[PDB]
């Protein structure tokens, strides 16, 4: 397995701070099944085996900020957090489904989103969880769709407000990490969840701070979701929607005041989720282009190596998740 190649996009340095951000969906044990991944042997799907490769990936990236999806509750506390503490990180985790009723056993296996940060470079000011179902319910204002299709979806985002230490260049940063509904037939939900996350992050912001937004969006670069984040808004009749929408605007258009750019824009990875049936870019690191520049990204796994090894889908004995990690070095300028 060849280490991945760094792509430099722009030279360093005005006074500014450099830091690296990882976004990685680890694939939780619950969903790593032979039914879903019938091309990967059971011994390679097993969590006792896969968690080694996942921890290795995270260790090797050595990001200053790490955003994980599909972190299983009990794994956050017994694996991800203890091991990352030993590397000088602190973390914040929130599971999905906290209001759902379930056994103690089941509660351990519910997954959610985690943000880790290097304590030498960052101090946590606030931490928040955004429950999309609750925000949908609270803003359904007589839309049956909001209620039937959006509210019934249990997805979450987490966000942390960090103080960036001066001796890297009082100075704040917000990192947000979310994981949107999966279903291809639910582009409206994916888009609404993204709009709710962003408007909810904006509320966090008052109480302006640059944003790093990591997510598994389950959405391709040509979607309403990506157009919305990238262009600072969308048409309220976008085809992905198939009145209450203005609740998330902040006239025909839903608007946000972040000015975001994808770290990997213009096709720097040909895919981010890699399976037999589906290969595409659905994971993203977005940043406030006002405050920050991209210096570089970790480029794709050498594609020749995958053809050499006849690897048509992940995970695989040597690739422990069906998603590839995203790793970016960003340059922040204070105001
Ligand atoms: Mg998944
Ligand atoms: Mg996914």
Which letter does DSSP use for residue 319 in this model?
A: B
Q: How far is CA 183 from CA 81, 131, 329, in A?
A: 30, 18, 31
Cα(314)–Cα(276) distance, integer angstroms: 8
Residue closest to 98 by CA, chosen among 156, 45, 47, 42: 156
Structure tokens at 65: 């900020």
Ligand closest in space to the Cα of 216: 2
Ligand closest in space to the Cα of 220: 2
CA R_g for the chain: 19
Measure 218 CA to ligand 1 centroid, in angstroms: 9
Ligand closest in space to the Cα of 278: 2
Ligand closest in space to the Cα of 179: 2
124 exposed, middle or buried (CB, 10 Å; 0-12, 13-18, 19+)? middle
Q: Please give the helix or strand (H or E) that residue 163 lies within, else none.
A: strand 156-164
Annotated catalytic residues are 216
Experimental method: X-ray
Contacts of 37 (CB under 8 A, 6+ apart): 45, 275, 313, 315, 322
Structure tokens at 252: 């025909």
Are the C-beta atoms of 219 and 186 separated by less than 8 Å? Answer: no
Measure 254 CA to ligand 2 centroid, in angstroms: 25
Q: How far is CA 21 from CA 44, 60, 287, in A?
A: 28, 13, 10
Q: Is 278 annotated as a binding residue?
A: yes
Helix 187-205 vs helix 224-231: crossing angle, to nearest 10: 30
Partners of 284 in beta bridges: 215
Q: Is 167 annotated as a binding residue?
A: no
The position carrying tokens 């690296």 is 20
Structure tokens at 220: 């391709």
Measure 31 CA to ligand 1 centroid, in angstroms: 7
Q: Is 291 annotated as a binding residue?
A: no
Chain breaks in the chain (C to N over 2.5 A) after: 13, 169, 207, 242, 250
Separate counts of helices (H) and strands (E) for the chain: 10, 17
Ramachandran sector of residue 202 (left: φ over 0; alpha: ψ -120 to 50; beta: rest): alpha
For the chain, domain boundaries: 1-335
Q: Is 218 annotated as a binding residue?
A: yes
Measure 70 CA to ligand 1 centroid, in angstroms: 7
Q: How far is CA 117 from CA 48, 263, 328, in A?
A: 25, 19, 14
Measure 218 CA to ligand 2 centroid, in angstroms: 5
Q: Is 303 annotated as a binding residue?
A: no
Q: Is 236 annotated as a binding residue?
A: no
Pairing mode, if any, of strands 172-179 and 211-216? parallel
Measure 216 CA to ligand 2 centroid, in angstroms: 6
CATH topology for 1-335 is Deoxyribonuclease I; Chain A (3.60.10)
Structure tokens at 43: 């011994």
> Is the previous residue joined to 92 through a cis bond, with omega within 30 degrees of 0?
no
């Amino acid at each position: 397995l060849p280490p991945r190649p760094w792509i430099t996009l722009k030279e360093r340095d005005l006074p500014s701070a450099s830091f690296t951000v990882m976004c990685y969906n680890v694939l939780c044990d619950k969903y790593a099944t032979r039914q879903l991944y019938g091309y990967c042997p059971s011994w390679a799907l097993n969590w006792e085996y896969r968690k080694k490769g996942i921890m290795e990936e995270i260790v090797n990236c050595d990001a200053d900020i790490i955003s994980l999806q599909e972190v299983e509750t009990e794994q956050y506390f017994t694996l991800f957090l203890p091991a990352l503490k030993e590397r000088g990180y602190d973390g914040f985790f929130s599971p999905k489904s906290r209001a759902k009723i379930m056994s103690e056993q089941e509660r351990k296996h519910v997954d959610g989103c985690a943000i880790f940060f290097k304590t030498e470079k960052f101090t946590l000011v606030q931490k928040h969880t955004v429950e999309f179902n609750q925000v949908a319910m609270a803003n359904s204002d007589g839309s049956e769709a909001m209620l039937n299709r959006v509210m019934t979806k249990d997805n979450i985002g987490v966000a942390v407000v960090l103080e960036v230490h001066k001796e890297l260049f009082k100075q704040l940063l917000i990192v947000a990490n979310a994981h949107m509904h999966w279903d291809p037939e639910y582009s409206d939900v994916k888009l609404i969840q993204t709009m709710m996350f962003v408007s909810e992050v904006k509320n966090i912001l008052e109480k302006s701070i640059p944003l790093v937004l990591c997510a598994d969006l389950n959405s391709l670069p040509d979607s309403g979701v990506v157009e919305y984040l990238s262009n600072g808004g969308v048409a309220d009749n976008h085809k992905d929607f198939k009145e209450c929408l203005m609740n998330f605007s902040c006239e025909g258009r839903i608007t946000h005041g972040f000015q975001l750019k994808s770290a990997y824009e213009n096709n720097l990875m040909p895919y981010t989720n890699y399976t037999f049936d589906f290969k595409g870019v659905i994971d993203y690191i977005f940043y406030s282009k006002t405050h920050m520049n991209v210096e570089g990204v970790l480029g794709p796994l050498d594609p020749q190596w995958l053809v050499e090894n006849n690897i048509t889908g992940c995970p695989h004995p040597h690739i422990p998740s069906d998603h590839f990690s995203l790793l970016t070095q960003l340059e922040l300028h204070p105001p």
